[PDB]
Design a protein around this nucleic acid. Structure first.
Ligand SMILES: [K+]
Ligand SMILES: [K+]
Ligand SMILES: [K+]
Ligand SMILES: [Mg+2]
Ligand SMILES: [Mg+2]
Ligand SMILES: [Mg+2]
Ligand SMILES: [Mg+2]
Ligand SMILES: [Mg+2]
Ligand SMILES: [Mg+2]
Ligand SMILES: [Mg+2]
Ligand SMILES: [Mg+2]
Ligand SMILES: [Mg+2]
Ligand SMILES: [Mg+2]
Ligand SMILES: [Mg+2]
Ligand SMILES: [Zn+2]
Lengths: 183, 140, 71, 119, 140, 55, 103
RNA sequence: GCCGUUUAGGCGACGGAAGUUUGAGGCAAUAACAGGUCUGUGAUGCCCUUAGAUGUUCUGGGCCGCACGCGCGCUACACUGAUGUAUUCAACGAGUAUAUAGCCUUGGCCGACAGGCCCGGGUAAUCUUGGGAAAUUUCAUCGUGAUGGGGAUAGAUCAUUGCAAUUGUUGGUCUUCAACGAGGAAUGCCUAGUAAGCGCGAGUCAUCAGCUCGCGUUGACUACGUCCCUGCC
């Protein structure tokens, strides 16, 4: 327990349930434990190197949108910290487990290309989960008194439970449905 | 604890403590144009803090403590920032020179900062002592 | 169209002093949405409840102020 | 009763030139402070002849000039100047409300556009 | 925080203008034409009016002092470079034009140029731009 | 007096006062470093003047 | 000897300037004069960027011309006589030698 | 190590500063196009004009004109923000005829600003400049309201450049406070220190940068394929 996120949250007790989505969320291995969701890492030179990037950092990078927020990663890390504290307040559990549960219960597993229904790979699954989570939080925050950190916390908490009150889960459902209608 | 100099304390707390120190000392005479002026022309409102004069005095006192030879133009550049030009791109702008000069002269009329022959302003031994003895009171 | 109030009425002050300390998370946004009050009033009410000692503070920051209940 | 900063027209006529600069706006003030060139004074020296040699209480004979960048003085409230606009001299009887303005501001150098075919 | 007051007025009829009582007094005074944020700030400071209050929180006397300052910024020592009518054409007096007098001064200043056939007055009369901007592609 | 109305406009500044030192054209003039050549003339004599293209 | 001599060398080429500098510092070290140098100043990069087209047609393509000025400073302690006796060898073209006597 | 005809090569891995011929440029074949340029050239054939000139110069005006259409852009529509404090990190480059002084300006004084005055430094790793850049950071205010978002338009006024500022050169001060709440059909650029954000320098230049050519700061998402479209072979 030497490395803790923000020196306030433990990594050892994080259980990544899905065996499929296990090598594409970098939380369990000790090599993927970091103090800060900020690395300035070169996780884009190769095709499958962003999978070995810490998952909190992958969540943080999707907050640097839109263009008005591009490159502002310290503010994104601040949002992540203030979101992880609200998560611990409203769930009394480890915020990293809530985050991995939300990313697991948000990635669509089947999609319709071309309209044949195709199955999503684990990497695109986690990418879509993160994209939907941060997109829903950002759209909740836009033109709203609620802070982006509070909207992110609410979205993550509702996605961890599996409730259809989270924009990501509603959208996952639509996506997979259109791949059931067009099977 | 004590034995902490200025380069040991958080600047945000040191400036707040030294502005209170200066306001308590009662050796600062404020101009008539304290509640009117803006710190710079790119500013669109006067400072919202009533004790902004003492806060800026503490800020410049600390800056003269850490560096020697700062002139009025240098302090105009230090407290200058971004100007928004309406429909035109923003650029850098400089601060007001009257405010900097008046506060520095008020700080010369306390023996905190003198003026060096080499140009600008230096910190006096009494000013160094004052800032260092206030830095020890700053809670860590 | 928000109709957030800027000054409490005595009934809303009573509800702020009784029901709000029972909230788990207490931030200006939640109080503004629930009590139908302005964000300035929310921040100032949070400061007053921190003065009467009816809440704790989990994290304070310029953008986000996070408070919780002591009980 | 034309005033120009609370003064009266007669007092303005009699007022010293160094004060009259201080009643004028900043652009005329800088113009006078940098010193007027020989063509500007010469035009007023011709306008005062036109005003004096005027037969009687009729308008002074038109004095044409190319001087568009000239500050209108209170001395010239009786003058009838024709300013060249590039193509012709437009006659203007200078009025006291015109004090401080340029002569160019009273001789249009283009034609007001009235649009026709969309083309 | 501060709970309320039985005297709290939601709409205050001020200088033939309606001021929202649910607004901070400084930005509430910017409802009257001729008063901007900076002149309202100066008026609030010179009238000794709390800037952390709301317009409805103030009493009758406080707005009376605000109007003493607004109708005579000079007696209250507001410098002359701070006025929207500096060195009036006819009068030559510095003054702060507020309310419908701003529109009146606009109309009179335009009529002055529309009688002397000045270029800018004719531009105003033609409904075109008066500050020397290109009119081919913008302003449509 | 024709000599006081011939070339009587001031040439203290303006584009119509500086000319190419190789051709006398007043357009596209590079005043940097005191070159005083036009763009086209500098592009032609640059090798002689000593400007080498590396990037 | 007595006085302090600063020889400034400038050039547009590195090899000629460096071999001239080597000749100077070799001559200085043969006559047993102490030499501080060569000291290489930051290289000046004179840059001109202009549209290659002699007109205004085509892709607006830009050629970037550069002139690189290399400055070398040699600091001896000696008398003027030995200095002009040293800086009298064949200085290669393009190299601007400049001798200045200090205290 | 595996794949590959076990070749030529590819993928992965250790090590390594670097493994994507390391990144980015410069240069860049044959053959063309009635491509642009006679308004760069004291490069030019021919034709026209040549003293009441299509020469030259001076004055003034125009190139800016405004029912409208199109292209490149800048500023936004906000709280992942605006405003006011506090705070502290670049790089590329540029700079004088010293005449009282010319360019870059330090320091002192006056001035709310704008600016002015007075001593000086620097032809420059020496002085401007350790380039005291912003975004960012911190605290506070605002509180979802076209609102403290936005700043178009407009009035008054003061300064500076200039021989001259009106058809506002520009910079200030107070005031005025429009559309715009994310943009239809379309369509552009982009695969890593990249896009995007942020500012700086240079060229133009007496003054004027919403433009270009460079610079650094902050710094992602997505893909590691295909011929579906577009084009080329
Ligand atoms: K040609
Ligand atoms: K020809
Ligand atoms: K040319
Ligand atoms: Mg929000
Ligand atoms: Mg100065
Ligand atoms: Mg911007
Ligand atoms: Mg052709
Ligand atoms: Mg044009
Ligand atoms: Mg700020
Ligand atoms: Mg508004
Ligand atoms: Mg604004
Ligand atoms: Mg121009
Ligand atoms: Mg420029
Ligand atoms: Mg295309
Ligand atoms: Zn040429």
């Amino acid at each position: 327990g030497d490395v803790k996120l923000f020196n306030r949250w433990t990594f050892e007790d994080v259980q990544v349930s899905d065996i499929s989505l296990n090598d594409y969320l970098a939380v369990t291995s000790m090599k993927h434990y970091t103090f800060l969701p900020h690395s300035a890492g070169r996780y884009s030179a190769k095709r499958f190197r962003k999978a070995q990037c810490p998952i909190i950092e992958r969540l943080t990078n999707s907050l640097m949108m839109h263009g008005r927020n591009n490159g502002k990663k310290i503010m994104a890390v601040r949002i992540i910290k203030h979101t992880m504290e609200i998560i611990h307040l409203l769930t009394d559990a480890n915020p990293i487990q809530i985050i991995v549960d939300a990313i697991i219960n948000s990635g669509p597993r089947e999609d319709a290309t071309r309209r044949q229904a195709v199955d999503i790979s684990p990497l695109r699954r986690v990418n879509q989960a993160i994209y939907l989570l941060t997109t829903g939080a950002r759209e909740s925050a836009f033109r709203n008194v609620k802070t982006i950190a509070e909207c992110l916390a609410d979205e993550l908490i509702n996605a961890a439970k599996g409730s259809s009150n989270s924009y990501a889960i509603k959208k996952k459902d639509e996506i997979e449905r259109v791949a059931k209608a067009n099977r | 604890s004590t034995a902490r100099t200025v380069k040991d304390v958080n600047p945000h707390e040191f400036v707040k403590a030294y502005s209170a120190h200066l306001k308590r000392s009662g050796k600062m005479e404020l101009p008539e144009w304290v509640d009117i002026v803006k710190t710079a022309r790119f500013k669109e409102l006067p400072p919202s803090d009533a004790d902004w004069y003492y806060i800026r005095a503490a800020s410049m006192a600390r800056k003269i403590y850490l560096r020697q030879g700062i002139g009025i133009g240098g302090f105009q550049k230090i407290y200058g920032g971004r100007q928004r030009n309406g429909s035109r791109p923003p650029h850098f702008c400089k601060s007001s020179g009257a405010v900097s000069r008046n506060i520095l002269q008020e700080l010369q009329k306390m023996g905190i900062i003198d003026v060096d022959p080499k140009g600008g302003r230096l910190i006096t031994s009494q000013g160094r002592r004052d800032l260092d003895q206030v830095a020890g009171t700053v809670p860590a | 169209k928000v109709n957030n109030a800027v000054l409490f009425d005595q009934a809303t002050y009573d509800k702020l002093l009784t029901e709000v300390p029972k909230y788990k998370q207490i931030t200006p946004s939640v109080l503004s949405e629930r009590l139908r009050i302005n964000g300035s009033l929310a921040r100032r009410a949070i400061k007053d409840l921190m003065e009467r000692g009816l809440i704790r503070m989990v994290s304070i920051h310029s953008s986000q102020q996070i408070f919780t209940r002591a009980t | 009763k034309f005033s120009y900063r609370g003064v009266d027209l007669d007092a303005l006529l009699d007022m010293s030139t160094e004060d009259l600069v201080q009643l004028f706006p900043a652009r005329p003030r800088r113009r006078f402070s940098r010193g007027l060139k020989r063509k500007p004074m010469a035009l007023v020296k011709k306008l005062r002849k036109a005003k004096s040699e005027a037969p009687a209480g009729e308008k002074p004979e038109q004095v044409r000039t190319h001087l568009r960048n000239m500050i209108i003085m209170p001395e010239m409230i009786g003058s009838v100047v024709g300013i060249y606009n590039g193509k012709c001299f437009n006659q203007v009887e200078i009025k006291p409300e015109m004090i401080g303005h340029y002569l160019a501001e009273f001789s249009l150098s283009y034609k007001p556009v009235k649009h026709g075919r969309p083309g | 925080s501060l709970i309320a007051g039985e005297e709290f007025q939601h709409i205050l009829r001020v200088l033939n203008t309606n001021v929202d009582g649910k607004q901070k007094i400084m930005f509430a005074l910017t409802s009257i034409k001729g008063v901007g944020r900076r002149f309202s700030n100066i008026v609030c400071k010179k009238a000794d009016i709390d800037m952390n209050k709301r317009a409805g929180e103030l009493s009758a006397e406080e707005m009376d002092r605000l109007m003493a300052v607004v109708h005579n910024p000079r007696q209250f020592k507001v410098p002359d470079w701070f006025l929207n009518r500096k060195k009036d054409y006819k009068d030559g007096r510095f003054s702060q034009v507020v309310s419908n007098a701003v529109d009146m001064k606009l109309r009179d200043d335009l009529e002055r140029l529309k009688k002397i056939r000045n270029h800018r007055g004719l531009r105003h009369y033609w409904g075109v731009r008066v500050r020397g901007q290109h009119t081919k592609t913008t302003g449509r | 007096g024709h000599s006081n109305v011939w070339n009587s406009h001031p040439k203290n500044y303006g584009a119509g006062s500086r000319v190419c030192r190789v051709c006398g054209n007043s357009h596209g003039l590079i005043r940097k470093y005191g070159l005083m050549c036009c763009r086209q003339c500098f592009r032609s004599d640059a090798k002689d003047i000593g400007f080498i293209k590396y990037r | 000897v007595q006085h302090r001599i600063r020889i400034t060398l400038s050039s547009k080429s590195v090899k000629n300037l460096e071999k001239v500098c080597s000749d100077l510092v070799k001559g200085a070290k043969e006559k047993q004069l102490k030499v501080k140098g060569p000291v290489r100043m930051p290289t000046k990069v004179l840059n001109i960027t202009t549209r290659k087209s002699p007109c205004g047609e085509g892709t607006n393509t830009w050629d970037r011309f550069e002139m690189r000025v290399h400055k070398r400073v040699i600091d001896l302690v000696s008398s003027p006589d030995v200095v002009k006796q040293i800086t009298s060898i064949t200085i290669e073209p393009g190299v601007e030698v400049e001798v200045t006597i200090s205290d």
